[PDB]
Symmetry: D3
């Protein structure tokens, strides 16, 4: 079946990871190709202001077993905000994918595992850059050096996710969050995200020059 | 009336935004001129070790409708710590002003709104650089992309403010906080702030070289 | 007596600060020499995957009264994760040492004080670079500009430490945490820490290039 | 009209010839940009390739033309093989910036460069202001960008904008000699070295040391 | 004694002449610093102005003199118009650093430069160590800063510290010719280009691409 | 075989002579690395020392040899005194990078440089790719690193890799003249200036201004 289902509802698109023979792994070339295409199509449709990314079934993404860097690079050029609605296990590359999204919310049955170290590996997809910016450096160290699972309540406590919902309330909550963004003029939403992206790395002077030019 | 009232109490100055015909907006040239002057006068009076910034009446600052960058640049050259005592609505430029201060405390009736996106605008004053450093990137994205209001308890929960007080206890609490700083030798307070400012952007090696030179 | 006791238990070493005539101060040349040696010996013994750093007696380190930068530089070249098990007062240089470790846990009788400002000084050892990355900039400003003590519960609330234990449960908890790391292949633990260190400062592109090369 | 980027292979060296004859080899058209994307991706994928020579068909290197114009800089940023600009004629506007984004430049005696944007009320929208100071130093980049005036081949040589100036007939032979001095070396090491050189433009010393240590296998 | 910074306008070009005759055009006095602040702010505000020529009255460009000395570098950092240093004579200490902080330098045959601080037991307190390597490269900046010795006009030309050396009578005519090659261009584009060039000294490529895309309107 | 790094003192100038005769002055052996660490630490500790001249015994500067190789770059990074490389002969591989890591280079007419790693399927594992572009610019560094070919003394001079080329007999006399132009200045100011110059390679302008203000006492 199609590894990434794309549903549109107004100014919001929902992307559903659907790799049922591999627990929603994102390392297959079909999925990577579909993810590239989804980003480019969302960028090109200026009516779209929010993407909700979630997984079909019990898993968000078991991750799977540079090519593994195409999905992270696709997200970096995505102009619209991306909300990860983490419905279940987010493991390995699947954990890093959720952490690379702009906002995370989770079902109570979700959990995260920066599992690479347990396999003799490091996060080859850039997860070590994004994780300390979601939970702080000490918690990112705990997650990366033990590889252990973090359940939904702990994730909320650490700021890894913004809210925790019952399994039935997760997607309704993601759409409510998406609509609080989508009510605003689409070009401004995209300009705001571009400015926020700049602020992660650039100096204050660079941000001031960009903000003055964009306004 | 004078748009920025300056009261002195020992080693602490209190600055009160007072633009009553515009809900304490800070975009007027009179206020901007007075803010410039206040910073320079505080820098020059080496007895001053803390500034408390607050708003007269019900508002901290409704913000108002590069020139909008003079106030942020004035705060960057202010050598003394600035405590924002947010007594009410802090909207738009007023939100960013509070976020640019070193420390925030709030009355229970305060709220914050990074409202620009709702107007088809981005924060033209550098708010996108400071906000992720107060609340983390995911919460800054939520605030900037929805533009929605954040009440005092939520702000405390997110780390946007350090304490929440009753409306009557706000300024007494700000002075207690200011005095915990002002009890210390004034030159060291200023050197410490200069070092902390360096650490926001510079490498560890740059901070080590500066600390070794200052000591 | 020996200022830094080194105990080995499997893949975990415990380092105990033991300067009983100076409340575990770390500014003495004997301690600094022993700390240098401990780091180099731990780096060279590839079986070691975790260091637990703690203090003998009632103090973690009262700190004491560039040379004060040798201990911070030793920690920067330490390849293995370091867990600070803060058993008591961590003051001045002792506070900064704990903050420079990768992870902190604390006994209920522990407290932290970025005390330099009260002495007319700034943190000459790089504490201003590490502290905002443990507690955020506003809390680091509060700690550095007042110099006041932060007790264990407040430290937990601010994210300065990851857990707070009874005085009797502190070291058992540190070993449980260390073992969650040490169960993993030692070379991967060290590669993961090296990647996490890179992510503190480098761009996303630099982290992606390093991760691709290490994998 | 024609394939906008002709791709020739000679051993481990590919030549890319800009060929937009109805617009003086402008690179701002979407057909060219798409072909440049594809050529970079194909060269990265073919581990037999070690060097690209980039040049223009006919009298022009690239007259430049009239975010989309930023796809070309980003493509060169992800290009793993060294790129030699063999500037055979006018390199104007976007064409000037393209040559400056390449790793090495050599020029024909009839070549010239112009950061012409300012003369039309424009700025270099493609990142030329980032690359030009790293080719000629900040003062000469300011002179070129703020006046927009043309810089001939001899002046370009004097400023270090190009490494050598050849007669029109000797340009491509010289580009191939230079390419062969690279292509003689083991192909994986050439690509790793370029990746290291790219990292050094911005990263700290510590970052370069970490990458070099990681790459040596 | 006199107005420390004389301001002349000729079309879109302003000339600022340092005039501190009782201290050999030193720029460390609070009167001069205040005037330099005001001149930058006035030039930014007058959108008709496109170029500043900075030069010294009499025999000296600036003997330098004896945070306050850091207001001048910060003023040039916020100056939106290009600044040409027309170095007519000795540029010593703070005066050397001022010339190096300008966008372009040209010099009279009697000019010379000296990063003299080290000879008096001092370091360049005004940021000269940041700007000098970007003018002459790190090795020559080390030579100038660690010896403190004087660099004459011909050596300065050879090192790229200045772009041209003119006879004493031809310096200001040459500075105006260079200024006019800038000032002929649309005034808003000249200022946007300088803002882009300033961003490129430090920012990543991605930051420059984002700003260039935002500025083109 | 012998002390791998001979240390001579003449007033405030120390000369370090690489002396590994059974391996053509290679610097990759653990004995040499240990001695280089010790020499840097001893020179930092002796406040009477103001300049180091680094050179090779015999015909070679350093043939380089076959993380451990990264201790030498890190040692030079913490060396507080200026280091002049007096390149008396072949500087190959790690030896090329060592010369480039020094503050100033001068060379004998028989010297040459080779970033030879790529020819053996290797990359510069010691940080040479970070330092080389800052000595010769990014295009020449790419040429040297991607071809690996030898650069003779005259070409090195032309590219700014070295500041002067001397006859074999005049090299060390010239190195001492250059060292004395530094060593004549107050020793604490020389070290503070180098610390400021090191900061400027990477830090923002604001960081340099803050450090300069803090260091002037």
């Amino acid at each position: 079946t199609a590894p990434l289902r794309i549903d549109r509802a107004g100014r919001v698109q929902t992307w559903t990871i659907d790799v049922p023979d591999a627990a929603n792994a994102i390392t297959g070339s079909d999925f990577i190709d579909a993810f590239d295409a989804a980003v480019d199509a969302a960028n090109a449709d200026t009516d779209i202001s929010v993407v909700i990314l979630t997984g079909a079934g019990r898993f968000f993404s078991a991750g799977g077993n540079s090519g593994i860097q195409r999905v992270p690079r696709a997200l970096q050029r995505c102009e619209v905000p991306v909300i990860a609605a983490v419905n279940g296990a987010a493991i390995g590359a699947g954990c890093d994918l959720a952490v690379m999204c702009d906002l995370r919310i989770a079902a109570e049955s979700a959990f995260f595992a920066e599992s690479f170290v347990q396999l003799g590996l490091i996060p080859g997809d850039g997860g070590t850059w994004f994780l300390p910016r979601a939970v702080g450096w000490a918690r990112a160290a705990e997650m990366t050096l033990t590889g252990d699972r973090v359940d939904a309540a702990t994730a909320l406590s650490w700021g890894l996710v913004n809210e925790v919902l019952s399994d039935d309330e997760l997607l309704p909550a993601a759409h409510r969050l998406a609509e609080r963004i989508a009510k605003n003029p689409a070009p401004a939403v995209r300009m705001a995200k571009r400015l926020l992206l700049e602020s992660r790395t650039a100096s204050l002077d660079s941000t001031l020059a960009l903000a003055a030019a964009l306004q």
